[PDB]
């Protein structure tokens, strides 16, 4: 297992997006993971449609702006046999309202055959998975210290009352403190955090991880 990983400079991460006032973090996290798995397999990096999942994944446990899970999103893309581009099917649910499903109006750009769940409450297993591709994870993002994060290695304070899905795109170590961190792509636009990213310290709140990051992790099979 490598000591450092950064899928952004390796070419598997699209620019930061903004979910705005739609409770569909589940779909943003799933799409970032699908974009990463697709690029690693095919070599092409293309922004994919969160709106398709929010609008179309309505026959299972996922509920648009009312929440869902990254696994439910993966299952929908598996069942649909594809997902469209962001360019063709842009995000319009920012005001808190999805629309009618338009998946068949466009040419699908990517597909996946399944997904895998990372062993729960297990940062070693999460690190092994993150070294191979971006990973969808769940965290408790309710603390004011998280809401107002700007820079540095975030160590809390935060509980494990999971309420937000984000994407791990790598991990590193700060040379001066010597502390290691997860590199996490959030969906709150570039005005939040480090141009949309947060470094979340590794090795905390065992076995759950900082803010519960190692509790509920998964990734798609391209």
Query: Tell me, what CATH number does 11's domain have?
Result: 3.90.70.10
Pairing mode of beta strands 153-154, 197-201: parallel
Backbone φ/ψ region at 109: left (φ over 0), alpha (ψ -120 to 50), beta: alpha
Strands (E) across the chain are located at 5-6, 114-117, 135-139, 153-154, 164-173, 180-185, 197-201, 217-221
Query: Is 72 in a helix, a strand, or coil?
Result: helix
Q: What are the catalytic residues?
A: 25, 164, 186
C-alpha distances out from residue 18 to 123, 137, 195, 206, Å: 27, 17, 12, 30
What method was applied to determine this entry? X-ray
Instruction: Output the six-digit token pair for 196.
Output: 């949309």
Alpha-carbon distance of 222 to 214, in angstroms, equals 22
For the chain, what's the residue count? 222
66: domain range? 1-222
Alpha-carbon distance of 123 to 111, in angstroms, equals 28
CA angle 193, 199, 200 (to 5 degrees): 115
Helix then strand count (H, E) for the chain reads 6, 8
Instruction: Output the six-digit token pair for 1.
Output: 């297992």
Tally of structural domains, the chain? 1
Instruction: Output the six-digit token pair for 92.
Output: 């319009």
Backbone φ/ψ region at 189: left (φ over 0), alpha (ψ -120 to 50), beta: left
């Amino acid at each position: 297992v490598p000591a450092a990983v950064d899928w952004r400079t390796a070419g598997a991460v699209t620019p930061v997006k903004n979910q705005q006032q739609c409770g569909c973090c589940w779909a943003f996290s799933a799409v970032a993971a699908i974009e990463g798995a697709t690029q690693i397999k095919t070599g092409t990096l293309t922004s994919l449609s969160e709106e398709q999942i929010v609008d179309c994944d309505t026959n299972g446990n996922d509920k648009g702006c009312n929440g869902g899970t990254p696994d439910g999103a993966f299952q929908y893309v598996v069942n649909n046999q594809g997902i469209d581009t962001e360019s063709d099917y842009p995000y319009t649910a920012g005001g808190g309202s999805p629309g009618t499903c338009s998946a068949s109006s466009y040419q699908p750009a990517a597909s996946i055959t399944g997904y895998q769940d990372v062993p729960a409450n297990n940062e070693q297993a999460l690190q092994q998975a993150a070294a191979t591709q971006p990973i969808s994870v769940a965290i408790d993002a309710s603390d004011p210290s998280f809401q107002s994060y700007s820079s540095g290695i975030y160590s809390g304070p935060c509980n494990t009352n999971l309420d937000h899905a984000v994407t791990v795109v790598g991990y590193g170590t700060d040379p001066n403190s010597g502390n290691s961190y997860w590199i996490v792509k959030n969906s709150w636009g570039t005005s939040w955090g480090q141009e949309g990213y947060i470094w979340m310290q590794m090795g905390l709140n065992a076995p759950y991880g900082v803010c519960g990051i190692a509790m509920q992790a998964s990734y798609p099979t391209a």
